[PDB]
Amino acid sequence: VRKLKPITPGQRFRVVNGYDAITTDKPERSLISPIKNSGGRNSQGKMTMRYTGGGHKQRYRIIDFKRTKDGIPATVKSIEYDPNRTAFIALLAYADGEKTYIIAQNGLKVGQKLVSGPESQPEIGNTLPLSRIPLGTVISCIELRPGQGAVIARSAGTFAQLMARDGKYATIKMPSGETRLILLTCSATIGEVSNSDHQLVVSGKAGRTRWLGRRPRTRPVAMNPVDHPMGGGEGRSSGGHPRSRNGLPAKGYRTRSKKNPSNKYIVERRK
RNA sequence: AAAAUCGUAAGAUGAAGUAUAGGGCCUGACACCUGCCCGGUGCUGGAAGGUUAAGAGGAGAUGUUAUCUUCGGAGAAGCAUU
C-alpha cells in the first residue's frame, strides 16, 4: 500500500495497492477462457442494472472452487493477480500432474505443499469438512451445499468463524455478522482470504472508476418529474421521501421475503 | 435459487460475482466541525386489547300444500328464498 506524492490534483490523495504478495505476471495458457463484458444489457438488449459501462477488457481464469481431489498433495507454484475478483489466485500443481487455480489465503507462500480431504491437518491452506474443523477457527470458502463449491467468504480479506456443532448442522458467523446453520458435510478452507489491504486503496481520480468498469451516476434530485419520482421543483429542492424508481422506500425498508423457505437456518439478521 | 432490473412466462442482467461484494438515496477534494426536537408525515419491531374480508356454520322466519278445520285458520314431509 503506497501513498503517491501530491504532484497532480488527480494524484494528491491517490493510494496504490502494494501487490507485495504477487510473484508471476504471466498467467497459465491452459486455464484461461474467453470472456466479454456487458454494459448491463441483458439477452434481449434492454439495459438492466445500469451504471456499468466498460473498460480494459479482461480474461477469465478458471478457478477451482470444489477442490474434490482428496489425499493428493499439491504445491503452490505462483501467486498471481486476477482481474475478475478481489483476491490473489496462487496457482497449484498437484502431485499426479494436474494444475488448478484455487483461491489463495492470507499466509499462502510459494512452495507450500497443502493437502485436501478429511484426513488433513487444520493448517492454513488445507480444506476440511465442518465435522472436523475443530472450533472457532477463522475459515473461508465455506460450502453451502456438499460437493457444489465455495460460496461464503470469497472476497479479499473476509473470513468466518465456527461456533458450535449440533448433530447435523454447525453454526457459523458470516462476514456480515449473520449467524446461520450449515450442514456438517460442507467443506471449508482454513485461514483468511488474500489482499486484506483492498479497503485501503484510494482512487483520487474519476478515471479509475471508469478503468474498473463503472459509469457516472446522476442524482435523481437533479432530474425532471417525468424521469424520477424525486425530480422537479423550481430551484434546488429535495425529493420528499426517498424512493427508488417505483415508489419503493429507500431507507429502512427490508426487501427480504418474510416467507422465505430458508428461514429455518438463520439465527440473527445483521444485514 | 441474493436483493434489484426487463418479460405473459420460459429466460437474461446482476455474475461464470458473493458482504473488503452487489443495489437504493443524499452530500461532494482538504482543515475545523456537523447543535435541539419523535409532535405531523415516512421506516423498523411488538402484538396483550377494539374493529375487520372472503370462505365455513345454520337459532329462526317466509312461499307452496298432504291433512284437519261449520267459517276463520293451523299446518308434517319435500322443494326454494332469506
UniProtKB/TrEMBL annotation:
Family of this protein: Belongs to the universal ribosomal protein uL2 family.
Originating organism: Flavobacterium johnsoniae (Cytophaga johnsonae)
Keywords in alphabetical order: Ribonucleoprotein, Ribosomal protein, RNA-binding, rRNA-binding
SUPFAM superfamilies the record matches: Nucleic acid-binding proteins, Translation proteins SH3-like domain
Listed GO CC annotations: large ribosomal subunit
Region of interest: Disordered: 212-271
Lineage: Bacteria, Pseudomonadati, Bacteroidota, Flavobacteriia, Flavobacteriales
Gene3D superfamilies tied to this protein: 2.30.30.30, Nucleic acid-binding proteins (2.40.50.140), Ribosomal protein L2, domain 3 (4.10.950.10)
One of the GO biological process terms: cytoplasmic translation
Entry's Gene Ontology molecular function annotations: rRNA binding; structural constituent of ribosome; transferase activity
One Pfam family matching this protein: Ribosomal_L2_C
Name under which the protein is recorded: Large ribosomal subunit protein uL2
HAMAP family, A to Z: Ribosomal_uL2_B
Chain ranges of the Large ribosomal subunit protein uL2 RNA-binding domain: 40-116
SMART domains with a match to the protein in the record: Ribosomal_L2, Ribosomal_L2_C
Function: One of the primary rRNA binding proteins. Required for association of the 30S and 50S subunits to form the 70S ribosome, for tRNA binding and peptide bond formation. It has been suggested to have peptidyltransferase activity; this is somewhat controversial. Makes several contacts with the 16S rRNA in the 70S ribosome.
Superkingdom of origin: Bacteria
Subunit: Part of the 50S ribosomal subunit. Forms a bridge to the 30S subunit in the 70S ribosome.
Domain Large ribosomal subunit protein uL2 C-terminal: residue ranges: 122-249
